[model samples]
Target: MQPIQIAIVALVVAIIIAIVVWSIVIIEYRKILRQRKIDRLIDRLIERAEDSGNESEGEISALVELGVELGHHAPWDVDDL
Candidate 1:
């Protein structure tokens, strides 16, 4: 192939690889956003439960359990919080 053709092919390959990498990054970022949102919801629910003096123990425990389910997937990373 001619030099110009070779250069064009190289550029196209690089662009494709860059696009694939960027797509992966975007997907991971979106998942991080979703996780953070879940965490925020858990935090709010916990706060609301704390504020409710009339709430039964069973009801509060259930809400806390739901928060734990949403917020912490990695038990080993408990210290991070």
Candidate 2:
């Protein structure tokens, strides 16, 4: 291969690797945002349940604990919430 051809290939591969890294980083960043939103929802729901003081507070509290457990397990799966 010519000198210029090798340099061109090297540059293209470098950009390709950059793109791959950017994509994975973007996904990880998205996970962070999603987890943040889920955490916010959990806090809000807990507060709302506490303020109401309904008979269902116990159930709501248990459900919130379940959410906390699920959040700790896979906090990224807040699609249903």
**Which ten-residue region of model 2 has the weakest summed lDDT?**
72-81
C-alpha TM-score for every candidate:
0.29, 0.29
Candidate 1 residues lying further than 4 Å off, grouped into runs, are 1-6, 30-81
Residue 66, model 2: Cα distance from true site in angstroms? 40
Q: Write the per-residue lDDT of candidate 1 for residues 1-81, one digit (tens) a residue.
A: 634453578788899899787876776684465656666876777788856455366777667656777885634344532
Candidate 1 lDDT trough over 10 residues, lowest sum: 72-81
* Model 2: per-residue Cα lDDT at residue 12: 88
Total clashes for model 2: 0
User: What are the lDDT scores of the predictions, listed in order?
Assistant: 0.66, 0.67
lDDT for predicted candidate 2 compared with the true structure: 0.67
Q: Write model 2 residue lDDT over 1-81, tens digit each, in one string.
A: 635553578788899889787866776684465656666876876878856444455666667767777675654454552
- Backbone clashes, each candidate: 0, 0
RMSD of every candidate to native, in Å, equals 13.4, 12.5
